[PDB]
Design a protein around this ligand. Sequence first.
Ligand SMILES: *[C@@H]1O[C@H](CO[C@@H]2O[C@@H](C)[C@@H](O)[C@@H](O)[C@@H]2O)[C@@H](O[C@@H]2O[C@H](CO)[C@@H](O[C@@H]3O[C@H](CO[C@H]4O[C@H](CO)[C@@H](O)[C@H](O)[C@@H]4O)[C@@H](O)[C@H](O[C@H]4O[C@H](CO)[C@@H](O)[C@H](O)[C@@H]4O)[C@@H]3O)[C@H](O)[C@H]2NC(C)=O)[C@H](O)[C@H]1NC(C)=O
Ligand SMILES: *[C@@H]1O[C@H](CO)[C@@H](O[C@@H]2O[C@H](CO)[C@@H](O[C@@H]3O[C@H](CO[C@H]4O[C@H](CO)[C@@H](O)[C@H](O)[C@@H]4O)[C@@H](O)[C@H](O)[C@@H]3O)[C@H](O)[C@H]2NC(C)=O)[C@H](O)[C@H]1NC(C)=O
Ligand SMILES: *[C@@H]1O[C@H](CO)[C@@H](O[C@@H]2O[C@H](CO)[C@@H](O[C@@H]3O[C@H](CO)[C@@H](O)[C@H](O)[C@@H]3O)[C@H](O)[C@H]2NC(C)=O)[C@H](O)[C@H]1NC(C)=O
Ligand SMILES: *[C@@H]1O[C@H](CO[C@@H]2O[C@@H](C)[C@@H](O)[C@@H](O)[C@@H]2O)[C@@H](O[C@@H]2O[C@H](CO)[C@@H](O)[C@H](O)[C@H]2NC(C)=O)[C@H](O)[C@H]1NC(C)=O
Ligand SMILES: *[C@@H]1O[C@H](CO[C@@H]2O[C@@H](C)[C@@H](O)[C@@H](O)[C@@H]2O)[C@@H](O[C@@H]2O[C@H](CO)[C@@H](O)[C@H](O)[C@H]2NC(C)=O)[C@H](O)[C@H]1NC(C)=O
Ligand SMILES: *[C@@H]1O[C@H](CO)[C@@H](O)[C@H](O)[C@H]1NC(C)=O
Ligand SMILES: [Zn+2]
Ligand SMILES: [Zn+2]
Ligand SMILES: [Zn+2]
Ligand SMILES: [Zn+2]
Ligand SMILES: [Zn+2]
Length: 447
Amino acid sequence: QFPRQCATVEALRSGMCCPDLSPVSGPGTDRCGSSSGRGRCEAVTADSRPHSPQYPHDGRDDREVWPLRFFNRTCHCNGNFSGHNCGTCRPGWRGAACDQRVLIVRRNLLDLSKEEKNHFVRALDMAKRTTHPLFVIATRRSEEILGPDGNTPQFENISIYNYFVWTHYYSVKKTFLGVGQESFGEVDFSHEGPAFLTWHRYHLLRLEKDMQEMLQEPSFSLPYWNFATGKNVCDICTDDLMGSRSNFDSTLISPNSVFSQWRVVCDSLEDYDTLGTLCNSTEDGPIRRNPAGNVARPMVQRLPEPQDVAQCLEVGLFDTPPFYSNSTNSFRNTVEGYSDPTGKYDPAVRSLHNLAHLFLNGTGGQTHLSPNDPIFVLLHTFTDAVFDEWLRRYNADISTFPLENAPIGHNRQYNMVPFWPPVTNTEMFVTAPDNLGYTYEIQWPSR
Ligand SMILES: *[C@@H]1O[C@H](CO[C@@H]2O[C@@H](C)[C@@H](O)[C@@H](O)[C@@H]2O)[C@@H](O[C@@H]2O[C@H](CO)[C@@H](O[C@@H]3O[C@H](CO[C@H]4O[C@H](CO)[C@@H](O)[C@H](O)[C@@H]4O)[C@@H](O)[C@H](O[C@H]4O[C@H](CO)[C@@H](O)[C@H](O)[C@@H]4O)[C@@H]3O)[C@H](O)[C@H]2NC(C)=O)[C@H](O)[C@H]1NC(C)=O
Ligand SMILES: *[C@@H]1O[C@H](CO)[C@@H](O[C@@H]2O[C@H](CO)[C@@H](O[C@@H]3O[C@H](CO[C@H]4O[C@H](CO)[C@@H](O)[C@H](O)[C@@H]4O)[C@@H](O)[C@H](O)[C@@H]3O)[C@H](O)[C@H]2NC(C)=O)[C@H](O)[C@H]1NC(C)=O
Ligand SMILES: *[C@@H]1O[C@H](CO)[C@@H](O[C@@H]2O[C@H](CO)[C@@H](O[C@@H]3O[C@H](CO)[C@@H](O)[C@H](O)[C@@H]3O)[C@H](O)[C@H]2NC(C)=O)[C@H](O)[C@H]1NC(C)=O
Ligand SMILES: *[C@@H]1O[C@H](CO[C@@H]2O[C@@H](C)[C@@H](O)[C@@H](O)[C@@H]2O)[C@@H](O[C@@H]2O[C@H](CO)[C@@H](O)[C@H](O)[C@H]2NC(C)=O)[C@H](O)[C@H]1NC(C)=O
Ligand SMILES: *[C@@H]1O[C@H](CO[C@@H]2O[C@@H](C)[C@@H](O)[C@@H](O)[C@@H]2O)[C@@H](O[C@@H]2O[C@H](CO)[C@@H](O)[C@H](O)[C@H]2NC(C)=O)[C@H](O)[C@H]1NC(C)=O
Ligand SMILES: *[C@@H]1O[C@H](CO)[C@@H](O)[C@H](O)[C@H]1NC(C)=O
Ligand SMILES: [Zn+2]
Ligand SMILES: [Zn+2]
Ligand SMILES: [Zn+2]
Ligand SMILES: [Zn+2]
Ligand SMILES: [Zn+2]
């Protein structure tokens, strides 16, 4: 989850992740672009406030108070600069002085031209195969991060797209259970709590930026899938888009799609939970997808109705106690899909976002794997657009987003795990057009 240049013995020893930008006088000369005034190496701010109760709780999880288990100093950027070394710009700005406004437009995948559809599928396929230029991932927990001989960092290179899968995995995986140790209650830093929407928004912003850099196309934008159609089919499961069903195995993707060649990451839960390792960059096994084919669970065999979206946008409180999968009259819990579209909780219901995932009946609907299916991108940009419209309706009213006692990872000033550099739920809780450099071309149902 860290810049390559800080995944070292010295950097972990110093507790500093403050890489050079333009070090002309030898190493360590231009930390955070300080020599041009772009930023400075400073102490990190991490959320101190208490999280909702956990039984048991020994507090040894590396994700608590992220990222202080690893680094306590980072680059704090000035003005409109940003990035791990202050070498780029805040979203909505570009140029060497980061003084030129930019606005990109996220569009319905089906409204794209034939040529733009092909461009998008080629870009995703390239992200799947190209090494992330900046980040490396840990294969081991903190206490074993330097290897058996105490001098070998257990980090691996990873593709742009696989890094997107890994960060989601790391946010949901179980805290490691030794011998004789009673099983902990489950935690989730990115679902089942108010950080659901701010977490997934940043996730997307980072993938978009990585792909813009990979293509050298500053204007590249992620499109969205309008899943609120009521349909009994996936209307983007064609061989020019996300891939139709294989005629040889109805849970596989058509071999006339590039996505039939993708192999998934993070699918060895049993090894992670027994050996106490983390997901590494080795791929293993194809995407499984089978839209509408969950015969056991019939409620999951049709997609959300258009009016499900108009209804959830009436729910006027962002979230409500106890800030969890059983909140009621919570906009967040409604869009996430644990409560019906009017606001009303009910443990049997699956709506909106959760329904879209479960409809896929495969890789796309297991929480540790789901981003391995690229439909995840398009389902999350749609979910984000609903979030953005709610932010516009209700003047970005953050007041019900709890400062304390939310499930771990979900307090308002938590650094969303495991993103780098540190970034709070607060920073994503803004209207995108004016604050984050992007808008959606979309029409809402008028009820
Ligand atoms: C910011 O980070 C600095 C730590 O760097 C890493 O990054 C953070 C994020 C964590 O991951 C951290 O674990 C990493 O090390 C941090 O400075 C570091 O602070 C630690 C904790 O105080 C220092 O270690 C302690 O040093 C004292 C005194 O130094 C002696 O060193 C040797 C012995 O090894 C001999 O020369 C003498 O005995 C010296 O007196 C030790 O007494 C102490 O040992 C005891 O505590 C540890 C656990 O803390 C036990 O395991 C031992 O058994 C002992 O009971 C520690 O080893 C470390 O030197 C220091 N590093 C540097 C480079 O300065 C800084 O404090 C953080 N800043 C803030 C604001 O938190
Ligand atoms: C995608 O959809 C598939 C079909 O809906 C999902 O598979 C089904 O998942 C359910 C829920 O876990 C399984 O239910 C269990 O069934 C066993 C009994 O097993 C046998 O059931 C029938 C006979 O009744 C038999 O024909 C099957 O071959 C099984 O051997 C119960 O004892 C358990 O308590 C539990 O209810 C189904 O078995 C399973 N069905 C099939 C056809 O596999 C699949 O999980 C979905 N995948 C994803 C990722 O969403
Ligand atoms: C990266 O992650 C993969 C997935 O966890 C690792 O591969 C897996 O490693 C385990 C443990 O070494 C293998 O299990 C063992 O297999 C032997 C031989 O069949 C068996 O006798 C043992 O009882 C044990 O179960 C597992 O098969 C293997 N799976 C795959 C896909 O190869 C891999 O080692 C990780 N890499 C690093 C650098 O940690
Ligand atoms: C992990 O990757 C680094 C960096 O790779 C470079 O940048 C990537 C984004 C991609 O573009 C690669 O094709 C690039 O090569 C590798 O770094 C090289 O490592 C060797 C020795 O390990 C060193 O001699 C080279 O000079 C390094 N180059 C740079 C730019 O740092 C590294 O090897 C990879 N690690 C493993 C285990 O494969
Ligand atoms: C809603 O469900 C919770 C479920 O338990 C916890 O909820 C979150 C805090 C989550 O982050 C996890 O730690 C847990 O799964 C119910 O919590 C219970 O609350 C009662 C009353 O306050 C308490 O005595 C219980 O011990 C809690 N449960 C556990 C597992 O300890 C909560 O009551 C539910 N509320 C509604 C309105 O249904
Ligand atoms: C930088 O960008 C923000 C984002 O909208 C803008 O509001 C602000 O006025 C800008 N300030 C500077 C330092 O130019
Ligand atoms: Zn804790
Ligand atoms: Zn998710
Ligand atoms: Zn291009
Ligand atoms: Zn209908
Ligand atoms: Zn999701």
